[PDB]
Every structure is written in C-alpha cells, then in structure tokens.
Amino acid sequence: AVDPGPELDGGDFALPEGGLDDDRRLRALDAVDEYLTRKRKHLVGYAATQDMQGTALDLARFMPNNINNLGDPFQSGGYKPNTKVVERAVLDYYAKLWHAERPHDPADPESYWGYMLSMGSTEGNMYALWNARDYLSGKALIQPRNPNAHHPVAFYSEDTHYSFAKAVAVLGVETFHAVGLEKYADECPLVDPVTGLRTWPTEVPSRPGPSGLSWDGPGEIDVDALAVLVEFFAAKGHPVFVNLNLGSTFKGAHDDVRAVCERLLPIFERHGLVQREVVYGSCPQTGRPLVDVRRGFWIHVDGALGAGYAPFLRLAAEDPEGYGWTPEAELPEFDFGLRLPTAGHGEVDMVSSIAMSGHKWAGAPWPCGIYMTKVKYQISPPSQPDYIGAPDTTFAGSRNGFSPLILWDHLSRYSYRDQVERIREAQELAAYLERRLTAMERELGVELWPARTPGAVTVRFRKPSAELVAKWSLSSQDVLMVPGDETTRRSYVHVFVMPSVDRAKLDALLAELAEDPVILG
Amino acid sequence: ELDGGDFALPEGGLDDDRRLRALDAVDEYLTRKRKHLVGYAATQDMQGTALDLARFMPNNINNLGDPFQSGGYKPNTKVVERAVLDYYAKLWHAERPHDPADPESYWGYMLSMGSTEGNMYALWNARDYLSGKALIQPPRNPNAHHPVAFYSEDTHYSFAKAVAVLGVETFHAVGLEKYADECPLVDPVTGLRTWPTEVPSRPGPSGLSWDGPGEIDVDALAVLVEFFAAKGHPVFVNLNLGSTFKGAHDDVRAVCERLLPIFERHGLVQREVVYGSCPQTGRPLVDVRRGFWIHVDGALGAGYAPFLRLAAEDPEGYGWTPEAELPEFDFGLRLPTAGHGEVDMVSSIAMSGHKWAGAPWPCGIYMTKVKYQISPPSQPDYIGAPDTTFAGSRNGFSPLILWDHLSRYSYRDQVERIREAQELAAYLERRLTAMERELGVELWPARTPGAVTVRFRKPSAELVAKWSLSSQDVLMVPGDETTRRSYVHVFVMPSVDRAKLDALLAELAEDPVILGAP
Numbered sequence A: 001a002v003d004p005g006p007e008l009d010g011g012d013f014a015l016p017e018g019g020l021d022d023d024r025r026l027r028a029l030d031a032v033d034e035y036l037t038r039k040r041k042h043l044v045g046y047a048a049t050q051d052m053q054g055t056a057l058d059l060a061r062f063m064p065n066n067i068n069n070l071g072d073p074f075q076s077g078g079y080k081p082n083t084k085v086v087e088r089a090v091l092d093y094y095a096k097l098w099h100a101e102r103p104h105d106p107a108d109p110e111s112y113w114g115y116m117l118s119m120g121s122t123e124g125n126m127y128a129l130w131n132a133r134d135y136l137s138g139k140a141l142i143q144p145r146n147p148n149a150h151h152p153v154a155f156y157s158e159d160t161h162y163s164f165a166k167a168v169a170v171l172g173v174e175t176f177h178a179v180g181l182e183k184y185a186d187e188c189p190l191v192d193p194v195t196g197l198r199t200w201p202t203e204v205p206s207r208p209g210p211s212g213l214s215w216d217g218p219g220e221i222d223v224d225a226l227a228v229l230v231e232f233f234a235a236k237g238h239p240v241f242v243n244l245n246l247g248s249t250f251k252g253a254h255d256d257v258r259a260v261c262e263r264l265l266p267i268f269e270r271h272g273l274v275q276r277e278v279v280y281g282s283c284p285q286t287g288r289p290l291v292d293v294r295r296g297f298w299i300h301v302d303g304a305l306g307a308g309y310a311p312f313l314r315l316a317a318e319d320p321e322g323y324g325w326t327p328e329a330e331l332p333e334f335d336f337g338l339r340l341p342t343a344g345h346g347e348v349d350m351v352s353s354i355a356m357s358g359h360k361w362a363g364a365p366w367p368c369g370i371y372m373t374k375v376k377y378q379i380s381p382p383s384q385p386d387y388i389g390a391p392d393t394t395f396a397g398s399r400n401g402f403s404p405l406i407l408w409d410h411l412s413r414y415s416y417r418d419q420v421e422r423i424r425e426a427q428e429l430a431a432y433l434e435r436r437l438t439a440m441e442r443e444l445g446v447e448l449w450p451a452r453t454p455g456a457v458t459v460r461f462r463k464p465s466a467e468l469v470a471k472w473s474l475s476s477q478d479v480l481m482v483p484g485d486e487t488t489r490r491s492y493v494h495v496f497v498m499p500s501v502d503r504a505k506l507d508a509l510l511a512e513l514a515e516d517p518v519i520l521g
Numbered sequence B: 001e002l003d004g005g006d007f008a009l010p011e012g013g014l015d016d017d018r019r020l021r022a023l024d025a026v027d028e029y030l031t032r033k034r035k036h037l038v039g040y041a042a043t044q045d046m047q048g049t050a051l052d053l054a055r056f057m058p059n060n061i062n063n064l065g066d067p068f069q070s071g072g073y074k075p076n077t078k079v080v081e082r083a084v085l086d087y088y089a090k091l092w093h094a095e096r097p098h099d100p101a102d103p104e105s106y107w108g109y110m111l112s113m114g115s116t117e118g119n120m121y122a123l124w125n126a127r128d129y130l131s132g133k134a135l136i137q138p139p140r141n142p143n144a145h146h147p148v149a150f151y152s153e154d155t156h157y158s159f160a161k162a163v164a165v166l167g168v169e170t171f172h173a174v175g176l177e178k179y180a181d182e183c184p185l186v187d188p189v190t191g192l193r194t195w196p197t198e199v200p201s202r203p204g205p206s207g208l209s210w211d212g213p214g215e216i217d218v219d220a221l222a223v224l225v226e227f228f229a230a231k232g233h234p235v236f237v238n239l240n241l242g243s244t245f246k247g248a249h250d251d252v253r254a255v256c257e258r259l260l261p262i263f264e265r266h267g268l269v270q271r272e273v274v275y276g277s278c279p280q281t282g283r284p285l286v287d288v289r290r291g292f293w294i295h296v297d298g299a300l301g302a303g304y305a306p307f308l309r310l311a312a313e314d315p316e317g318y319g320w321t322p323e324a325e326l327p328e329f330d331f332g333l334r335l336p337t338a339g340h341g342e343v344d345m346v347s348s349i350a351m352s353g354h355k356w357a358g359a360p361w362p363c364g365i366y367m368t369k370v371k372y373q374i375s376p377p378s379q380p381d382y383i384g385a386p387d388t389t390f391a392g393s394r395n396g397f398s399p400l401i402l403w404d405h406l407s408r409y410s411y412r413d414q415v416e417r418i419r420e421a422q423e424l425a426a427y428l429e430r431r432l433t434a435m436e437r438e439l440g441v442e443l444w445p446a447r448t449p450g451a452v453t454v455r456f457r458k459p460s461a462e463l464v465a466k467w468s469l470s471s472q473d474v475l476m477v478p479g480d481e482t483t484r485r486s487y488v489h490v491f492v493m494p495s496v497d498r499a500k501l502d503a504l505l506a507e508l509a510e511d512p513v514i515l516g517a518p
C-alpha cells in the first residue's frame, strides 16, 4: 500500500553524440539526488551505514585529484598523487584493534602486512584465498611423497557469503565437498539429518535451530561437524583452509573462532600441519628441489561486517563498569592475538588473515575495506613492474586512494569509547526491534516469524509487500524449511541495525509493517 | 612529503584542529603533485566533476548485482551505469540494447577496481568459455579443454597476475611443459629455439624489441598460435590498445586477418564443447562455441581510439587528419570466412575510466557479448540480482563520474581532445631532439607513431619526483645486466597542455643528469 517513490527514468540519462547542455545535466543529477536521498534515508535492510555528512564536508575537496595508491602501501612509488601515508595510518589503527604486531616490518615475519581494498570484501576474500592457495600449495614466499600435500581443501559454513563460491571458482581452490565427491565418494563421515545417508554436504553444516535443521539456527558453524570434516581430510594428508564468518550476511552470526581454533589445533598437530617442510619448485643439478617450513593450515576470518565492531563490543565485555555496558552475548576472540598452546610446538598464533568492508560498519560512499595478514605469509609477487615504483603485492593494480581518506576521517572522529557506544546502541536497538515484532504478532494476531541470533545486529522476519520491501531496501532470502522440498519455502527479509539506524526509523518501519497487506494476510 | 606523525590515529580520536591540519597537509601535497603529474596515463583535471558530484558523497551507493537487473539495495545508480555502458557500446560498435535473448548483444559492467579487474574478468570468462564450463541460462583431442594464452612482451603486469590467479596457462608454460623442443621461433640473440616468455614485440633499430614500437609482432604471433591450434588447444589472445610504457597499439585488424584462417583450418570457429554429463546418465552434454577469444586491453586506448578513428574517416569534417593510422579493434570488426560468411572477431574489451577520461579513483568498463556469458558461480537471494560480476558490492559513484564527463563533451569535443594530445606528443618529441642539438647531450627520445607518450633518458630524481615521471629499465641485450638503460616517459593526457610541457622542458634543459650525460 505504501509508496517507494519513482525510479530513475533512463530517458533522462541517455548520452547523445552531441553531449547534454547544462540544464539537462543538472536536471538529471537532481533526479539522481532526489532518488538516492529518499532511498538512503529509508534503507534498513543491508549492512551499510548511511550517515556520512561529516565525511562529505571534510573530503569533497579531494575530488579534483586523480589519486592512485598504485603498488604496495609501504613504498610511495612513482605516482606521487597518492595517500599511502594515510592508508598506513588506517592499517595501523586496525592492526592495533585486531592485536596484530606493529609496525609493519618486512624483516619481522610476525609483523602485520595488509592493504586497503579497491572493491569491497570480495577483493579481500579473493586475496585471502589466493594467498592461502599459494601458501598451502608451496609457491615461493617473499622471505626465504604424500600425494595430497599440495592439494588444499576449503571449509566454511552454509552461512558463508556467495563471494566464497565465486572466489573458489576463480582461484581453482577445491572445497571439501568437491574433493569428497571426486576422491572419497562413499566416505563422508557425517550423516545427513534429513535423509540419514552419508552424502557429502555442500558446505560445513551450521548449527541447528528449533526445527533440528539449519534454516532456523543461529547461522554459526557447527564446530563438531567442522572438526569431523577437517580430521577426515587432514588424515588423508591435505592442507586445510578454513573461512570463519564474523557477522554473517543474512543472520549476522559470529562463528566461534576461538572454539574452532581450540578444536582444530590438536587435529593439525596430530597430522603434521603445524610445521611442515614444503618443496617450492626445483632447478637442474645432481639434485633439484628447494625447501622451506610452513604451516599446513590457514584460518581466514571474513569480518566484512563484524571486524569493524567486534573489537569494540569485546572491549566493553572486558571492562563493563568502565563503559557502562555489559554486552548481552559473548563475541568470540577472533583476531591476530588468538594464541593456543600445543603438545610439542609452543604457542601457535591461530589466525592467518582477516578481511573487513569499510562501507559496512564505518560507512563509505563506495566499496572499500582491508585485507590483513602477516609478513611470514606474503607470496612472491606475480611480476616485478618497474613503472609503478612499488611492488605489485596487491589484487588491484591501480588502487583507490580516496578510501583511505574516508576511513581515516571516520576513525579520527571517534574515540574507542564512541565506537563502543555505536555498537551498544545498535545491539540494544536490534533487541528492541525483536521485542516490537513479537508484540505486533500479539496485538494484530499475525505471524512475523521474527528471529535474532544473540549478539547480532540483524533481525529477520516474514517478507512484507513488494512495495514495502522496495521503500525500505529490505534484503530478501528464501529458505526451504526441509531441504530439497520446494513446498516448504518461506520468504524472509532482514533489517540491519547500523549506527545510522535509530529508534525513530525503526518505529516508522514498524508502523508501516502493521498496516502492510501481506503482513495482515 | 607527508609526515606520518600528523596522521597517526589515537585511541581517543583527533580534535577538529588536528584533523584539519592533517587534511590541509594532504591537500597541499596532492595539489602540488597533481598539477605537475605528467608521467602516468591519468587525466588530472576534474574541477567540474567535483563541483557537480560532491553532493553525492553522503550516500553509501552500491551497485550490487548485475547492472541490468533490479536488486534490493535501492540506493544504486544502475540507471546511470547502463547509460554509460550504452555510450561505450555504441562507441565500440557493440550491439545495443543489451538483451539476454540476443546472443549478439553486448553485456558489460562498470569496474570497482581499474582495468586490472576487467582483464581478470576477461581471462576468467575466457578460461571458462574455452574450457567448456556451463554458459548462462537464456530467458580425438586431449587438448580441447586446455586453453593457451598469448600476448606481447609489452603487455601490462596485470596479465601475469591474472594468469597466476586464474590458473591460465601461457604458451611459454605449455611450451616448456609439453613441447619443450618444438618451439617454432628462433631467438634473435642466441639463435636457439628457446620458448620466449611472451610473444615478441616488433624490433627497433637495435634488431631487438627494447627500442621497437611496442606493437606485437603479428608474424610471430601467427606462428605461435598455429603451433598450439594444430595441437587442438583453444586460444586466448590479448592485444594491447595503448600499451603501458610505449602507448603502442597492437594492430588488432591485422592480427584478426592473420589468425582467422588458422582458426578455420583447425576447427576453432565452431567447436563442439563437452560441459559435463546429464543428471541421469554419463552422456557427455555438448553445445557449439568458438575456440578462440580475442581480448582488447584498452585500459588507456579504448577511451580515445574511437575518436581518432572518427577523424580518420572524415578528416575534412573534423578539420584534422591524424598522422598515424589506429587499427580497427572493436566489436564491429567482422571478417569474411572461407565460405563468404562473416565472423565478429573480438570477444571482449577493457577500459580504465581514470586513464583517458579521468576519475578520482580507479574505475572502468568490461564489455563482452551475451553469447559468452558464463553461468554465475552461485545464485544468492539476498542481492535480488544475478552475481555476474567480479566484484560483489560495486562502486556506484564511478557511473556518476563517467556520466558527468561524457555528458559534457560532444564527439567533436572528444576528437579535439585526442587531436591536441597527439599534436602535443609530437611537439614534445620535436623539442627533445632540438634539446639534444642545443646542449650536445643524448636524451634517447622515442615516440611510437600515433602514441600519446614519449620516452627519454631518466633525468634527476628530483625532477622525476616533481613531475611524477614513470620509470622503466631496459636491457639492450636481454640477460646482460651491463646493457641496462633507465628511461622515463611522459603521457600527454587532456590535462597536459603546452605550458606544462614547456615548463618541464625548461627544467630538463638545466637538469644535472641530462647535462652530465656521458
């Protein structure tokens, strides 16, 4: 029944051979602004902070510059209009926040290395899986018999973002499902809870909900299931890549990164994956191959969303009196500071890489973010281009040097305490939304199927009318309540409570939901 | 330079005074550098852009999903993105509108990185298309599924990267692995049949490629492509349209004319491809595809080459005859088959928006045809649009940047932009040789005919850093480190005018490395 307002008309934007005069140009740009302004003020269905007035005022001045952070962030290079000094400051801030070792130092293998992304976290996850594929397969690093030793196998939950399926295909990294079907067809160690057959699942199971199946579960990886699957492949001699979701796309779940690491480390130690000799190439002689020592596992944290707020929630959890807030749910230790003891290898720093999107929690006018790892994992670049004056250590070639300014400006405006307040208000407002949806069910006698994983900044509920979805940019997901059976489909939407989503905005949405024709029935 | 101390981000934040001081320091640095940058292919003037588009800075714009599909993230500029894509589709003689039911119609999208993304996407798309992975759903030979990649020694480093990312095998790798003693080319330095690492570029006065024009040697390419095509391999060829260091244009028309008969001889125009078996039986399912893919890396040159070719076709109408011929390169390039049919030769093009047009961050275009589209890696509900692109979230500000640029200029204005740059590149070359004679020094100036860049001897570090001159070392005899020469180049972009070049030249004439030249 509500009005999402008119879309843009392509006729206004057609670019003729002769160009457009100033009046037609301004009319078009005004139409874009009127559209974008209406939509941004009502967007509540995606993990995208929408308020950036301060940014715009501070940084509009930089638009006349063709900024390019071409090459590694830790060398200027020949393209002098670059913001690498700013990029390093932003990377340093997140390195501290994620308990990485600073400063970056190419002679310190344990120190951080990372760079700012020109796409979103899609670039960071692609880079992670490239870096891990090469590291685990034995390609040469920047610093100097088992048939499966150079055949890595990827593991991640059913709540993992579609970017991984893409990245897996781009990079030719094999999932445990693919390798299971190919080489180990009848040896799946898990029993399917629907069919009772030992069929290889397509992703690692996520935890079950009230249904006994994952569709209504919290969206967290099932650690038991993961450990069974990892043991299976590690015992066969495969190196192991694990992606863990810190703020999953639809449910905002946090995989229990510490629990996963505690479970898997003994498996890694049992199967010789903590420290192992790796043959990297060869050359003609009496002998042949070169050799170095590497770990045989790689744990990546997809923190596209959650790496931006989780450190601040955990700060409050550590000092609840000081911040005046005890978070409702525990968020798992997930970062470069996570270190575990072993039987005979000393303490092991468990996480190899993290990705974060800057346009999610912080907010930006275009996609950006961070990939971070450690110097000891850096792969030799694919080539040595003279013409950029800095090593080609990154996924992108030319790199966005405006995004460093965006994030620097954001981070400079807020103290740690202010950042804690932002995640507090969002957590409290997500809880409020869930409370209001169940109250609506009782007031109106309607089913909304509301759900919210404890500690998540998103709430899911029954999809309303198409018009309401379009007004508020609600993101949609269908689930089959019993996998395989198309008659059990439910359509959900979700709301992401970002720092730009306040009580008034949620109350306005709720007032419209209460009068929506699909909701009423 | 900028001092990192001014930029460190404390736990407690920075106050408004420290914040403004830092941002002022950045602006002062960037402003000084941008006004003197002449060494990279990056248009530096965008005052109009800034005035028109700063207003959009408050929006978290996201063009998530396919440009031609509705999606749930409503603060998007896909209507604008499609207008930009339509403009370049026309400019590159693609078929419009995009229509998923028309195999011949264009498909493309705007890049969130630069052309690195477009070249990566091209090679991904070609790898899957040539290997037999499943195509997008509309509304014997042991080498058949092993594509081999070919490109010249002047190809940008993004290809070496993309090859490694995507696991695409170059002719050099396949040659060493499978055909170690069968290289059909003789090395001009050693006289041995050693597989070269890239397809040779054309020789210069030296007899070697270092002082050549930077264009692919079409003969050498044809010999190499025939070799692998006769073995049953499908073929990926990348052609440079405005190469990175020399600004050369591979002769795409000549390449296509040379290669088509080779493709016909070895059954690569129409090739039965097995893309798995049916869900019931192990019956190899098959459709018909071409067995070659020609990609044009027009990072730079796809932005200006159409306009120069416009003038070449009507020189009295535009008041300009370009001195150099630029090759036909685009989606309109169609050649006759042996049977007097026609074949559209080019499969894809990439362009960077931050090169010829100018942008405040990297952006660009990848374009192909609907008939080449691969089935998406998965089908996510939560964007509401197919995942058909390299990026996930996508930059929806870049469409505004390029739309604003393109809306400001007529075809005639765009012709004038490339005219002026061509004429100024020729002027710069004239001035450098005049300087050699006046000062009695060797500057090694070189300009490939039709290029917007001129190379010369590397001057002092100070001058290099002031004018952001890009540097390249060459070995004048490959493998001999004693023959190293250090060059720089100047790119004459639309924001490079005569005054700027004359100011550079005045400094070069008093430069200590130039004057101290042995």
Ligand SMILES: *[C@H](N[C@@H](CCSC)C(=O)OC)c1c(COP(=O)(O)O)cnc(C)c1O
Binding pocket: A046, A047, A048, A119, A120, A121, A122, A123, A125, A161, A163, A245, A247, A248, A249, A302, A304, A305, A357, A359, A360, A367, A368, A475, B062, B064, B382, B383, B391, B392, B393, B394
């Ligand atoms: C990002 N997920 C959302 C992107 C739009 S909201 C700013 C999404 O897919 O919702 C439909 C995301 C990615 C990919 O990051 P990009 O920045 O889009 O490239 C990866 N991993 C997770 C967990 C995400 O949420």
Ligand SMILES: *[C@H](N[C@@H](CCSC)C(=O)OC)c1c(COP(=O)(O)O)cnc(C)c1O
Binding pocket: A068, A070, A387, A388, A396, A397, A398, A399, B040, B041, B042, B113, B114, B115, B116, B117, B119, B156, B158, B240, B242, B243, B244, B297, B298, B299, B300, B352, B354, B355, B362, B363, B470
């Ligand atoms: C881009 N080449 C230059 C990028 C800096 S100038 C804006 C370069 O390498 O500088 C010396 C280029 C690419 C890659 O495009 P990106 O936009 O950098 O990702 C690919 N192909 C060619 C021919 C290029 O020139």
